[PDB]
């Protein structure tokens, strides 16, 4: 028996799960979506241009008010941008300039940042002293932090470059739940509207669904052939999409446990950095390494819009909860508001 | 027109002034990236310098501020975070000369150097080669020949020729020879010498970028 029998059993589970996935296969969404009319070409313009940053912008996130957004760039500065009037509400200097992830708390009282440093710093915005100060130093990780997202005013879920994903609480500063299912490096995270399930993609082309409370792998997806660099949640909370360096985007449904479609075009051959969804879910916006940001129809899976307002790699892409505007940031140190 | 937003605009102007000052400050400073296999190899030059994630080393030499980033402790796939160091002036790559007799490790260093050299992100960044363990290599030559892991090698076993052979074996992997320039140098026990070589190489690279911007390269 020994490792031979165990490996054969694992292979048998793999075949059984593949056959089960084939069992529910009914029809590709493309044919059923033929009934609904196409969205058509979408003309998009940049209403505001944020030129405060001077280095490459890596990550950004919108607030719950759909007005304030937080930007992270390699120069080691976080800027809170007022979208309506293009004003810098706050400027937070970072001890570690190598920052590639940031998030905005749902209540708008806390922000988080991280990157090549193994510490996920938490900053307070509403300090009575009037200045921004560090609240917690989550330094329990070993690998580089790639994505951190606020789950509540006292709980934050973060993913590191190692094979472990950790859930942290602000009050104590210790790891509550640790997930070790992934084998590669986790790049991006996404929190469902319910705030009970969250997906995670790793470099091994594996997307896994994790439960915040119970803490085990609920779903697995292996439709991609390369690293999952971008991942986001569909607004309804039952579907999610992934972006990879293979120049293709894909949409998965938790209930179906299958890849419903893949978004790609022959001309596009470079990787994908960030992905986001619109309020209605019709529009699937994803950044690309080229000097272009592509908007796809999530249902028909076709190129619906083209944003060529950038001259460098597009890295971050955030969509307001109300869908009033979309902000796209690139490595050109310029952030533009689009709608 | 506005009533209270003028104060916000003024505050934004102060923030912009501070950001511009910090940007000029950072632009004046020069960045260096550390790479190699084996902690002692990198720590040797760090100790030789004269004034947990990445380790930041700041030192002023000849009125120039040097920022050296040690990324050897990350232990993560370089393919997903090497692009962060696109703008670094030079990459200090360290390889121990005495590592050839240890288990194969010289072959691993050669693969690491090949991967770093052929990276698309480092297409216009120079690499500074620091061959550590100079004395240990000379002691090793008298006991073990270089031909154990170098079957193609055929020549006398001496310090000069062995060092030259290792140098030219590390040099050929630079496929894009026209753009990049490898400034190989042997680590010296005497202080105030390696830093001189690093400063000279960085000055040469900066002159090259200046001439590129002029319109001559």
């Amino acid at each position, epitope marked *: 028996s020994e490792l031979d029998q165990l490996r054969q059993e694992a292979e048998q589970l793999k075949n059984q799960i593949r056959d089960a996935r084939k069992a529910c296969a009914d029809a590709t969404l493309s044919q059923i979506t033929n009934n609904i009319d196409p969205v058509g070409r979408i003309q998009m313009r940049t209403r505001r241009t944020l030129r405060g940053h001077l280095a490459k912008i890596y990550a950004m996130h919108w607030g719950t008010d759909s*007005r*304030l957004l937080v930007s992270a760039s390699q120069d080691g500065k976080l800027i809170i941008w*007022d979208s309506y009037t293009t*004003n810098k*509400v*706050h400027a937070i200097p970072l001890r570690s300039s190598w920052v590639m992830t940031c998030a905005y708390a749902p209540s*708008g009282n806390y922000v988080a940042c991280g990157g090549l440093d193994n510490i996920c710093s938490i900053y307070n915005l509403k300090t*009575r*002293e*009037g*200045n921004v100060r560090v609240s917690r130093e989550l330094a329990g990780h070993t690998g580089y932090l790639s994505c951190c997202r606020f789950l509540d005013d006292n709980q934050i879920v973060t993913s590191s470059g190692d094979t472990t994903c950790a859930l942290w609480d602000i009050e104590t500063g210790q790891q509550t739940t640790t997930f070790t299912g992934h084998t590669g490096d986790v790049m991006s995270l996404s929190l469902a509207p319910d705030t009970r399930l969250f997906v995670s993609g790793a470099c091994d082309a594996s997307a896994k669904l994790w439960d915040v409370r119970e803490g085990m792998c609920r779903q697995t997806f292996t439709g991609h052939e390369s690293d999952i660099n971008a991942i986001c949640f569909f607004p309804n909370g039952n579907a999610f999409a992934t972006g990879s360096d293979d120049a293709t985007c894909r949409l998965f449904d938790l209930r179906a446990d299958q890849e419903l479609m893949t978004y790609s075009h022959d001309n596009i051959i470079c990787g994908i950095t960030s992905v986001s969804f619109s309020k209605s879910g019709r529009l699937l916006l994803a950044g690309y390494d080229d000097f272009n940001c592509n908007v796809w129809d999530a249902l028909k899976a076709d190129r619906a819009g083209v944003l060529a307002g950038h001259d460098n790699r597009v890295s971050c892409l955030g969509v307001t909860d109300d869908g009033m505007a979309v902000a796209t940031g690139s490595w050109d140190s310029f952030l533009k508001i689009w709608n | 027109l*506005s*009533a*209270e*937003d*003028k*104060a*916000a605009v*003024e*505050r934004s*102007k*102060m923030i912009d002034r501070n950001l511009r000052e910090d940007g000029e400050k950072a632009a004046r400073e020069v960045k260096l990236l550390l790479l190699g296999a084996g902690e002692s190899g990198k720590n040797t030059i760090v100790k030789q310098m004269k004034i947990t994630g990445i380790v930041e080393t700041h030192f002023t030499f000849k009125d120039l501020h040097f920022k050296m980033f040690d990324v050897g402790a990350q232990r993560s796939e370089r393919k997903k975070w090497i692009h962060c160091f696109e703008g670094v002036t030079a990459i200090i790559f360290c390889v121990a000369l005495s590592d050839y007799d240890l288990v194969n490790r010289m072959h691993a260093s050669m693969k690491l150097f090949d991967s770093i050299c052929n990276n698309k992100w480092f297409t216009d960044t120079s690499i500074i080669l620091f061959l550590n363990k100079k004395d240990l290599f000379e002691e090793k030559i008298k006991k073990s020949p270089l031909t154990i892991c170098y079957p193609e090698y055929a020549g006398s076993n001496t310090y000069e020729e062995a060092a030259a052979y290792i140098q030219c074996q590390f040099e050929d992997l630079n496929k894009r020879k026209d753009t990049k320039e490898i400034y190989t140098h042997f680590t010296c026990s005497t202080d105030t010498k390696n830093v001189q070589f690093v400063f000279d190489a960085v000055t040469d690279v900066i002159i090259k970028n200046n001439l590129k911007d002029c319109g001559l390269f």
Partner: single-chain antibody
Amino acid sequence: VQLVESGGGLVQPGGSRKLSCSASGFAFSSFGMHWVRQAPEKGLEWVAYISSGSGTIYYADTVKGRFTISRDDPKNTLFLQMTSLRSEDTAMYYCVRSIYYYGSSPFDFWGQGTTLTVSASADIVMTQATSSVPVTPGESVSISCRSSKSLLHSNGNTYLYWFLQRPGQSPQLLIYRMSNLASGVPDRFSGSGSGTAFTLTISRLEAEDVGVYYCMQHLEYPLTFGAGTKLEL
């Protein structure tokens, strides 16, 4: 957070002196400063304002030119120089901090104040409906006010501030912009308005509510105060 004023005292007619205020517990550099004086028998009234960058210095119509305000950010202290003082200048002066950004709560902290005494148009006029209303514990009191000009700015926010000054201490901010609660204020307080008619409702009054309530507008540059309504336990 502490704003301790000093330097007041007795001044002969047409005299001069320098009021000082040392700031601690907060970033003085970021916060702009306001000066408000209260006459022994009258209400509050704004004097001058200095922004964070020491620019856009504003002065009241009745004190323009005569008074001057300066700051020294390394020194972490505020200076208020006055000369050729008049009889009406006798009042208790408070230094008030203020930060200006989206979601801010300006005028959220007031100093203990310094006393000054002297030996023997085109502004916003706020009409106070009442000056004294007897109340009892456990009841509800509503205070109504009228403004000469509508304060509903095109941006959607109204510039209204409510301050409460109990006997023996400086005024305390209750509600700013008639839609937000200041830090440390019990949630029982509430405010509403229609652009011109403003009402302040204090449900479930306790004994600590005894004091005089002052209204303030921040639409136009010249800040003004109301006559003040005093509540009797």
